[PDB]
Ligand binder design. Sequence first.
Ligand SMILES: NC(=O)C1=CN([C@@H]2O[C@H](COP(=O)(O)OP(=O)(O)OC[C@H]3O[C@@H](n4cnc5c(N)ncnc54)[C@H](OP(=O)(O)O)[C@@H]3O)[C@@H](O)[C@H]2O)C=CC1
Ligand SMILES: NC(=O)C1=CN([C@@H]2O[C@H](COP(=O)(O)OP(=O)(O)OC[C@H]3O[C@@H](n4cnc5c(N)ncnc54)[C@H](OP(=O)(O)O)[C@@H]3O)[C@@H](O)[C@H]2O)C=CC1
Lengths: 477, 477, 477, 477
Amino acid sequence: VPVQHPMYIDGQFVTWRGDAWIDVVNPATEAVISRIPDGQAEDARKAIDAAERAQPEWEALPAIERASWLRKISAGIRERASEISALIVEEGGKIQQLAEVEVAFTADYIDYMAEWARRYEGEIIQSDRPGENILLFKRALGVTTGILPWNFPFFLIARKMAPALLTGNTIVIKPSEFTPNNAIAFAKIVDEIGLPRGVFNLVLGRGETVGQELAGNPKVAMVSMTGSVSAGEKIMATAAKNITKVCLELGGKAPAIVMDDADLELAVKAIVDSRVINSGQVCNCAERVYVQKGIYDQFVNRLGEAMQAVQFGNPAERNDIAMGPLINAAALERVEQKVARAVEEGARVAFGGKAVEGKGYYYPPTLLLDVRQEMSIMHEETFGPVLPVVAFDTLEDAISMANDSDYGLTSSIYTQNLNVAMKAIKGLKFGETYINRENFEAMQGFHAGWRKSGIGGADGKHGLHEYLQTQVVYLQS
Amino acid sequence: VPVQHPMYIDGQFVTWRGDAWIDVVNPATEAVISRIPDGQAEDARKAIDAAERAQPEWEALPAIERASWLRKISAGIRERASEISALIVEEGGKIQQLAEVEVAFTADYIDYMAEWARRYEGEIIQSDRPGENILLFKRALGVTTGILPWNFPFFLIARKMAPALLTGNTIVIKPSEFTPNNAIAFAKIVDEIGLPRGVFNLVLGRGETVGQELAGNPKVAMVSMTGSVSAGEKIMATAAKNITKVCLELGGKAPAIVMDDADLELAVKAIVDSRVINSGQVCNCAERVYVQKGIYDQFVNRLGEAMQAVQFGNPAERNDIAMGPLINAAALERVEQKVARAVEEGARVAFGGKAVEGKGYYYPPTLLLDVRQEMSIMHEETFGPVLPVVAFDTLEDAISMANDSDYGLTSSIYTQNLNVAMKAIKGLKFGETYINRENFEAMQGFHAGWRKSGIGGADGKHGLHEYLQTQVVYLQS
Amino acid sequence: VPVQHPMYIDGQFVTWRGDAWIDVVNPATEAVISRIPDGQAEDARKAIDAAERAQPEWEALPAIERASWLRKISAGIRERASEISALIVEEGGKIQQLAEVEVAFTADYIDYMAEWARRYEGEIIQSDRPGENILLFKRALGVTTGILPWNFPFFLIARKMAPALLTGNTIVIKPSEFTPNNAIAFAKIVDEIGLPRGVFNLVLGRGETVGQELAGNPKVAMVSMTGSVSAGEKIMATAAKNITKVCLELGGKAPAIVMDDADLELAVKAIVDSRVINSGQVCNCAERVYVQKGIYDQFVNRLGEAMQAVQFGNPAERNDIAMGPLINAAALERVEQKVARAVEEGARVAFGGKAVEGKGYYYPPTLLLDVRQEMSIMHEETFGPVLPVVAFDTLEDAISMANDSDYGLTSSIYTQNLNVAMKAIKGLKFGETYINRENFEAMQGFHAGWRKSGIGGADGKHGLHEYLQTQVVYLQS
Amino acid sequence: VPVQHPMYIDGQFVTWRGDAWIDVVNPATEAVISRIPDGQAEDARKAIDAAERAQPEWEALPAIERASWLRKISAGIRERASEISALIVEEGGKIQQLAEVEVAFTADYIDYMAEWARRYEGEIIQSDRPGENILLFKRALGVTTGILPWNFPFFLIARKMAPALLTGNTIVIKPSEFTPNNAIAFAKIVDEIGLPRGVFNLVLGRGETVGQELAGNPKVAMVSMTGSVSAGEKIMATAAKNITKVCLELGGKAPAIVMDDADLELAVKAIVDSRVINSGQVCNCAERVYVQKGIYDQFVNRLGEAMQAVQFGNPAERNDIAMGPLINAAALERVEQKVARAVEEGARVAFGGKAVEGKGYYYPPTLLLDVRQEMSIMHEETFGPVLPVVAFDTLEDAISMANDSDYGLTSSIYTQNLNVAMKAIKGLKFGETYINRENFEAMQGFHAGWRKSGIGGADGKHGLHEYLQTQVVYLQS
Ligand SMILES: NC(=O)C1=CN([C@@H]2O[C@H](COP(=O)(O)OP(=O)(O)OC[C@H]3O[C@@H](n4cnc5c(N)ncnc54)[C@H](OP(=O)(O)O)[C@@H]3O)[C@@H](O)[C@H]2O)C=CC1
Ligand SMILES: NC(=O)C1=CN([C@@H]2O[C@H](COP(=O)(O)OP(=O)(O)OC[C@H]3O[C@@H](n4cnc5c(N)ncnc54)[C@H](OP(=O)(O)O)[C@@H]3O)[C@@H](O)[C@H]2O)C=CC1
């Protein structure tokens, strides 16, 4: 029977008494795998108030002790890696290999963030006043909130809660309505190790209800969210009411530039190895491929060939496939319309292009050629495993077309010339630029997007600092 | 005849052709000293588009060259210090000594920010990938905007434009509708030295018109503003539409804690020397004074006495006064209502308390005693030179009442015990904490408020970084 | 039978064929517990050449992989904590509780240093040259050497090898001639986990022979040593021949200042809890106690009383004692002469003072009063558990007498006044200053002494950086 | 009449009463241009004691005030640029254009170092102890000393005194025996502006006398010196006696690598524009040129041609020459022997090679071909304007031969391939690596050599920090 999940508030699971429920489905089979409460603002507040009551003592704990708690959580996750991976596979529809890697990476991530305990520092600044000391301490924000999407849901829990908890903050996470299972599992692990009550809270429900509360509540020092530009806009607008800080990651349209002097094998491999790191969906995966004439011909063929081998199907019954289904009906439909609409503007369907009609939501890896910068397929979050390929004459053109977007999170260039690389770097307006390799942010790097791609960022030292604020003390004599 | 100011766009003053005009008045005499255009969104866009066209080349300039331009501007300001001070005095109504100091400080500030040219740095992070380099470059945001208030208007130009220009950004400033004169003077200096066209733009008008455009325009990478929580809320909400970054400083209710073991002379002096650093108005000046029983009696008397000597009048005709008039009618009225409303709740008028009726907007330094944390005078931006004094029993009480506010920008404590100081520091939830001295942020410190007091910050290295974003490059082999 | 230890070179223990041997004795029983080769320069070179051959590949390993090796070593140490502690107790003569803590701390230390893998960074500096990038990479020094003393020998292995190995260096350690056993045990653990050959090398022998080679060999990029000023002088002088970098920690005469307004209980406790963290010997333990008249009387009595409870004896047969014997005959004799010589100058023996004559080398906790800054007991490395107590009138006096020394490693002050603390801090010329607590350097702090106390330092980020050098790259276009 | 210079000690020039004098000569004309005292240790001590008496108050000054003094000195230097340049030209024998640039750069340098006043910072580290603060303050070393060489003597005054003075140190400089005039001029400027007495001291004499005292005096916290490896060895060995810190820059044998895919014009230009930035003498100038077969032929011809245009002669009577004479007879002779000795081993004299016999010390730009890594001309400080050119087959060869040296200060590579550049960077063991440009260290970079090239470094933030030490405060509650 499809299990009914309770929320995790103030150190204890609480059974939802409400009358309405949200059904969680398997994108592959399309059946009901579980049910979560249709939580409301009042639920979020219970969690926020608990987070608030527990924040002073949690922060009073030496950073090293907080790191210790984080290590117990990562340890709990490893002991249950397969159980958690299967949940990710089941509700997210991502291939088994990917799920396992997500679970391992998330545990390695929490451990990497635990290591900041004795390393984040404040500063001692020289004053102009005789005998005066200016101390700059790094304090915690207080209560923080996390609103996660269905892509990489398990990891996104750690990316937000780990930094927050290490710095002395308390957090209230709202997993995605479509992928709440891994979150429940995470809360079970938090419960087992016994993390202090209120430090970590999990509230189930919809973004418009539980999400808006996680952003508009006056007690929240900062609301962190990952997803679509649209939701980021509603979250920032609501946070505005209380001058609440925000941490947004709205992905985008990752562009990739392939020069003639580029290792043909590497580029094709890297772009393919990227793109479908789920079903395609992932935003840091080359959604816009720019190729110059001199190599266009060869590049397209190898690429076209590489994409055919990519088979799709139920992730749980197939460990030999490279693509699971899409997260849901809405996602599948939008991919069709956008592809169809694209072909009407001149898009040349070189591969796939026709939505599969049957149990689950699948879309064959599609390849669009003769695409133009002007076309609407270039200025929208594609979703599906679609790859538009626009030809270009020179680096200046390529850089100009890549920078031509409302998104500026991830970019990549495949070349071999010292000036081209350095010129592309200095020219590309993105938070990230991969040179001759696949797009996958390192935990010690800094995931932050320019323009509409976001505000603030994640990972590494700067990601950690997003959860700290400063207290400048002017100690006169 | 009251002069009519043109706007400064794309390297040249432009005469406003519109039919409507905004009258600039002298808070002291109450007469019309000049007129500024009632600018509209389209005006702001002309400036933004110019700022956008000029940004690439400006950033392409070596940081040292940009610093050079900034030094010419500071040099221009010093050559015209008196002229600019008198403008500040005239329209802002602040005492002459204060105006001169503002002009000198602002010039020293621009020079201090110019020194960051060769000092702000990116980082080289160790990768887990064999032979891979992770470079983290600091790039400019692009086009930025500044929306200034009437308090410290001249300096606030530099606090926003200096950091922005040094890092490679272009800016569009909208001075306050009540204090645009000093801004025009600043633009004249920018024009004289010949700063590259578009790098610095000045647009006149109202916040609801020209301000909303400076915040909602998709071409703006970041909008910086200083003023009231209310305006910050409208600015952040509008910036939300384009996920535009924001830099807000909404002042607050600066609290001050006086312990018994506190140098009575110093505290009284510091609190008085602060408070009226204009007419009172300044937000970093002890608006909430907490005193403990053991010293309450003596502290109130010396304080009461110190406040009587504070005389008010026209800043231009009086260099022996300690207080000019309030910025305008609205400000004066609110101060009255709030004082009256306060006395009804139990507030004991120990000094002043009655609004002066005549040319200009003056309010005698007022002292409210027997005030309670509960009273509404404690939870609002007082404006006028009013000082509520609430008694308290112990440090825990004092800290708890100081932290009890929607604002968390500035705080201060007067004591002598090593544990008290360290306990107050660790306990106070403010961006700043002054110990045994008056509240005046150092240029190399970091002016940033907790809670509703703001987002991001200003001054020092961290202030400089608010104008930089990161570009993480993954150079694989 | 007293075991004969082989050296650990190029990933394998090697049996010493030489004819001479150095006898290792138990300071408590005075019997031969083991024997180590009387190594010569040629032995050190074999190790250095191995370290050199292995350095390129070791450094080529991603920092995270090197950290992984370090974690295996710490894990090995914990699995054998008791075995290693007993060795420390046996040859070093330190009380059991201390040995266990040393073994645990050293393992926690290696793990703390392993966490620097993805955190130490180079920088990207703004150039004045159009289109030029200045990259500042942090590279490894190459081959490094460590020369350890008998105090905290086990930990001192990790304090030198952990930072070196994490940054990509290879190392050659020479344990102390009197305490080589724990080192052999450490090498066995390195061997078991299989650390790459040459990365870690252990060479046994005397300082004048194997030590001089570890410092004068042209292949050594840096020689790190901990011990007496005299040895530091011979090591630096030899390193001079090849402009070899040096890292010295020569301890000193840690002074402690007790003010009248100081928690009498805390000070007496902290000074006693310190001093004898072995037999006394430790250099960071208040070897010079300054007390002011107003509290002198009481402080001396409680202190005198606290010292009587400190019993001495064989660490292995007594877990109820607070002091083991001294490292050897020479140390015991010097303590006597210095005490006797001190009493002749006016020193008042308030407790102990008479060397015990029998198996082992013991010296009763001794207390010298009426001591004067002038006396020679204040300007020499006391060694034994002796405590001179000099009276003083004011802070200026106390600070001046504390700063009056050739050593500037550790200091401490017990007071409660905000100005006194801040005044003592700004006045004391030491690398460390403890306020109201016992002297024990934190792993994330920075152990570095002023004047003759050393060069460079250890622990924390700065300790880590001593093993890194910079490579500034000027990439023009 | 050849003027006789007095020393500058404790804020006042002091006339040398000794009987012996050292004659200063003009390398071009060879006549006596002035005379300096043959100072002795006692003279150096007078300066050190003055530096010591003045250090506390100087450091007590807010950093900004010290920076102010530094700006007055730079201002003084500009007002007397020509006077100072002519002195440099006269005694150093460097071409006029170079002297002027040195004087301007040194003044810009002092100003750049003055900007560190409010920027160098200490840190606030997280402790594991409940309620404990770890403050890490940056304090001054105390008294420092500078021992300068004849190359870039004026600038080397600022490179050592500017960082030292800004951080709160006092200094005692000993200019080079052959180039003391510019130093006297600098002291006159220090005197005119009125720098506090003792902060800056100038002592004339020989290295073996006044230099040894500047290094062996127990009151010196650190001795900074620039010159030959030999002198560095004597200075470090002497400093060893008191565990005195040292800052050495012993230049070396700067190698340069020219790949086939390298802009022939640029490389030839850069190597020529470098080399003779005086008479040749400069150590950061390609003293070892590595060229690969594929381009060897062409590279040698253009280079040979470029070197012919380089004319030599008296710098004061010729503003159309590219090379002045050598510093003295000894330097000229060594250049001959080494060239002659080189030709005997197989060196092919492609240009120049014969020492000019007449007034002054000149050596025609010489070009040695068919040189082998083995030859002794590759393993010695050439001095003269000699250029050995060794052919090589691949990058690995080139990198291996460049790294094959006891010196590791400066390196350069001329290529265009992204992998070659990145491979050369990661492979070259030098403190600096220039890519496609001439060798000239930036003031905000970091001049520090690997191996025998030095200890510590200069310029930029890290150069500044060499003059600071740390004070870790453990404030428990
Ligand atoms: N009504 C519908 O049918 C719609 C469905 N979608 C789905 O969302 C996908 C988009 O990708 P995704 O990465 O999930 O990103 P989203 O932008 O949808 O954001 C997902 C996360 O943001 C929360 N959120 C959504 N709206 C708000 C809001 N107004 N205020 C606060 N939080 C909010 C979500 O809640 P929650 O999980 O409750 O959505 C979830 O936690 C689509 O592909 C589609 O599957 C998108 C729009 C409409
Ligand atoms: N006796 C002779 O004839 C010798 C002359 N030289 C000259 O020195 C040049 C080397 O270049 P340069 O850059 O000047 O570098 P050096 O290594 O000669 O060092 C020059 C600076 O170091 C000082 N110094 C030299 N020896 C010592 C010492 N033992 N202890 C402390 N300080 C010392 C010098 O003093 P000072 O200026 O007094 O030398 C000077 O301030 C040669 O080309 C040659 O012209 C070198 C060796 C011997």
